[PDB]
Amino acid sequence: NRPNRLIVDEAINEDNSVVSLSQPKMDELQLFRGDTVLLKGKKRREAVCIVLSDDTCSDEKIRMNRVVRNNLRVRLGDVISIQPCPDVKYGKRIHVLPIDDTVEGITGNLFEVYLKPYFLEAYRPIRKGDIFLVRGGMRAVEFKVVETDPSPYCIVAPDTVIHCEGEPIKREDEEESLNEVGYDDIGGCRKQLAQIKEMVELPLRHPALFKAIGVKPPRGILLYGPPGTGKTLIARAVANETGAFFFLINGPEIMSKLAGESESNLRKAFEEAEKNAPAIIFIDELDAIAPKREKTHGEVERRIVSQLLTLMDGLKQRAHVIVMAATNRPNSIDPALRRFGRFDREVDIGIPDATGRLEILQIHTKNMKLADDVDLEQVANETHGHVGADLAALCSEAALQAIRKKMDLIDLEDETIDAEVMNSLAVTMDDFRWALSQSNPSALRETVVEVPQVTWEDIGGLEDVKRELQELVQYPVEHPDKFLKFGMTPSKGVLFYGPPGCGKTLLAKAIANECQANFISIKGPELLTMWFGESEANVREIFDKARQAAPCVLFFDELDSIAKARGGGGGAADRVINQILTEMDGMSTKKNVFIIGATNRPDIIDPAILRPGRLDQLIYIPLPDEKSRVAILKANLRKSPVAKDVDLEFLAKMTNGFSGADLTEICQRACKLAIRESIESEIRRERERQTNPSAMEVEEDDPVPEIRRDHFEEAMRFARRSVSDNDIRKYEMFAQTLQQSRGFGS
Amino acid sequence: PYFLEAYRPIRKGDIFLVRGGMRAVEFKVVETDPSPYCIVAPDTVIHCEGEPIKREDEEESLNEVGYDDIGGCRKQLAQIKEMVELPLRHPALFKAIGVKPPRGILLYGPPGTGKTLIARAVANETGAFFFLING
Ligand SMILES: Nc1ncnc2c1ncn2[C@@H]1O[C@H](COP(=O)(O)OP(=O)(O)OP(O)(O)=S)[C@@H](O)[C@H]1O
Ligand SMILES: Nc1ncnc2c1ncn2[C@@H]1O[C@H](COP(=O)(O)OP(=O)(O)OP(O)(O)=S)[C@@H](O)[C@H]1O
Ligand SMILES: Nc1ncnc2c1ncn2[C@@H]1O[C@H](COP(=O)(O)OP(=O)(O)OP(O)(O)=S)[C@@H](O)[C@H]1O
Ligand SMILES: [Mg+2]
Ligand SMILES: [Mg+2]
Ligand SMILES: [Mg+2]
């Protein structure tokens, strides 16, 4: 019962000689955050590192980098003893040698480019026989600390002369390489990688214990997503990091053979993974082998599908084999493969969000050298609809434009192998600014599931509606116990209705931002574009995406288009509304999926939507008042530089009966007047400066930097109301008599 | 915990079964000194040391499937017993009657509701020969 045996978890820090610990474990273990610890591992191999602190780190777990993890012959979830050692002295001679595979391109220097900035103000604790890694110069490079004269371990001081001359040596056959793929090469998919580790790590770490329990493990894991999102990468990383045997079956490579060779290749893969248990068999591109029953023709294709089903069912009589697979959508797989005892667990890898895209861009720009203006958060906010492969291509294209301009400088003697041109080489912001425009993203039709970025501050007015939406959406998530006590059940749906342009889409986004839930937006034209024989699996697919990503807000915008397409034979409108109604009835509230609709025409809505148990909360969103108009105009003008002279309350008194869209239109029109005036002034000053050279005052400056009362008072003369007064009386009537539409009605 | 406040009447040569610990376990009462049958009192010292022995080839195992592994389908299992139990219990008598039995029984339902299980249980519990063809 010792407090020094610890177990490895994933690393957050980026350094090669830093381990992390939580503070109570250090205080029990008598360690401070400047110490120099010694770490023992399997096959009697040990390491030396600098410890620091963390709060996200637990006590039963230590977080260390992959380079330390591979110098200890340790994988994820293994045992390591830590002990303090202030017995570390400085050095005199330290002999390093590169490793033969990483040094086949460059020749010339290795000391000043690589080793010189690495040990400067670092004092990295090294030991004899350790491999370390340096990034820089569009390449990563390995070295091994071969010999220390104060043997065996020391701290690299400026006293130590570092021998970097000799032959790059060969590897030992059990040295784990650093060009392999691990968990740090994957970004933007934290949750899914956690699920796959939970499913897979225990039945492959502990086969004997888990056989001795008597529980069944999973055996079929189907990864799916759009093309190019890193599924082959995830399977390869789980295989390398658990250390299991790994056999790869490729889809076209099996279907390209002749007949009896295809059957025997499948059978040999499953037998060979019997022999070397534990294993992982990865079937890449499954829908080339086993597509739909109606899309196969012949004897050979159906015979291969039946072969694969026999082997998947016969895995039960085997020991410790996981079968993974990958496909671009689940609906094209033969549905007999997704039963029980076959591919029964599904993991969905989607397109990344903004945090994900920044993390991809940081992965691919490791070995490159960036210029000092390049801010990758702006690139990550610009690139929308990019999967990971597109971001890798964008980084590669920017690097090639930089090397092309340096061949515009240096072309004559650049043909030799120089390290200096690589030293000077840098990628500016305009290269990324170029390659952003000449890039063709590939996931724009895909439905986006993310948290929105519209807070409550973008919305002006509407103060009781916000309270009512909190009490509908947020309260049965945070406080389920009150609803258990008082004996009621929460409701499921809301319908917003009202005049055009008053802020319904913004409210539906802001409550999803408030509750930190996902958000799926569907518009009426998107449902009507879905075809005659195609709308069915599509509406079911949207309600499935809502169940997988719960707690969710599923928002049906623009219902008046679906209503107007009925009656001019409008059969597709009736088919879509009936199928939405059936899916709402089937939905059980124990996943916290919450449904919202919105309409500008509350007179032609289908009354069966308003039934209790369906969208039966009716919130009327009206034209704003004078205080509300002041709040709207303040909300739209937060980014614009506005002069002090502007009176907003005067604009609110002058604009009566406007909606929110018209107030935004007035702001847009005034800003265009400002840009026109500025460009006239720049043409006039350029003309005058060029027509009178040698001017005594070279004073470049903003002539008008802000928006004054002239611009708003001119933009006010072109204002037009969007909602006429007869319409206002009709919306006031429906505000009270909408709920009576279900009987005979009107 | 098994024999505590139980006083279970045992006999020499019987197999019994204990559940617990994410596993079921078998034992056989091999030898009683008041031969052959007795009641397990706190007087009895219970020898639980030795080698776990092999089975006899006609010992019916308890990892097989019977009618107690099926739940939630009382009515249908009653129908299948009525159709099947008499023509397989008494073949000679039923041939001597002159009535035809059924010969094709189609079980159907959604995926995952235990159809393979029901057929396997009827096969084990009647003791008929059983051949499995897989599609
Ligand atoms: N999440 C990611 N993080 C880092 N790199 C990624 C990521 N996703 C994709 N990539 C890069 O994109 C390349 C192609 O990804 P793939 O693994 O081929 O994706 P995929 O699932 O194979 O798509 P298909 O349908 O097989 S073409 C990878 O080799 C990586 O370089
Ligand atoms: N209450 C409001 N506060 C701030 N901006 C608003 C408000 N209402 C409307 N806007 C602005 O007007 C635009 C239209 O708002 P939406 O919420 O999309 O209105 P809508 O109810 O969906 O009606 P339409 O048909 O879509 S214009 C928004 O993008 C805002 O720029
Ligand atoms: N009524 C039940 N009582 C107890 N366990 C059941 C029951 N139904 C299913 N199971 C369990 O579910 C497992 C799978 O059932 P199966 O016998 O495979 O059903 P099934 O009819 O084979 O479905 P398919 O279409 O063949 S995949 C069984 O091995 C049992 O563990
Ligand atoms: Mg692939
Ligand atoms: Mg809108
Ligand atoms: Mg079956």
From Swiss-Prot, chain B:
Mutagenesis or variant effect for residue 96 to E: In IBMPFD1; increased ATPase activity; no defect in ubiquitin-dependent protein degradation by the proteasome; impaired autophagic function; defect in maturation of ubiquitin-containing autophagosomes; decreased interaction with CAV1 and UBXN6
Post-translational modification: Phosphorylated by tyrosine kinases in response to T-cell antigen receptor activation. Phosphorylated in mitotic cells. ISGylated.
Subcellular location(s) per record: Cytoplasm, Cytosol; Endoplasmic reticulum; Nucleus; Cytoplasm, Stress granule
Residues reported to bind ATP 1: 111-117
Functional description taken from the UniProt entry: Necessary for the fragmentation of Golgi stacks during mitosis and for their reassembly after mitosis. Involved in the formation of the transitional endoplasmic reticulum (tER). The transfer of membranes from the endoplasmic reticulum to the Golgi apparatus occurs via 50-70 nm transition vesicles which derive from part-rough, part-smooth transitional elements of the endoplasmic reticulum (tER). Vesicle budding from the tER is an ATP-dependent process.
Domain notes: The PIM (PUB-interaction motif) motif mediates interaction with the PUB domain of RNF31.
Record disease entry: Inclusion body myopathy with early-onset Paget disease with or without frontotemporal dementia 1: An autosomal dominant disease characterized by disabling muscle weakness clinically resembling to limb girdle muscular dystrophy, osteolytic bone lesions consistent with Paget disease, and premature frontotemporal dementia. Clinical features show incomplete penetrance. Frontotemporal dementia and/or amyotrophic lateral sclerosis 6: A neurodegenerative disorder characterized by frontotemporal dementia and/or amyotrophic lateral sclerosis in affected individuals. There is high intrafamilial variation. Frontotemporal dementia (FTD) is characterized by frontal and temporal lobe atrophy associated with neuronal loss, gliosis, and dementia. Patients exhibit progressive changes in social, behavioral, and/or language function.
Family, as annotated: Belongs to the AAA ATPase family.
SUBUNIT field: Homohexamer. Forms a ring-shaped particle of 12.5 nm diameter, that displays 6-fold radial symmetry. Part of a ternary complex containing STX5A, NSFL1C and VCP. NSFL1C forms a homotrimer that binds to one end of a VCP homohexamer. The complex binds to membranes enriched in phosphatidylethanolamine-containing lipids and promotes Golgi membrane fusion. Binds to a heterodimer of NPLOC4 and UFD1, binding to this heterodimer inhibits Golgi-membrane fusion. Interaction with VCIP135 leads to dissociation of the complex via ATP hydrolysis by VCP.
Protein name according to UniProt: Transitional endoplasmic reticulum ATPase
Gene that encodes the chain: VCP
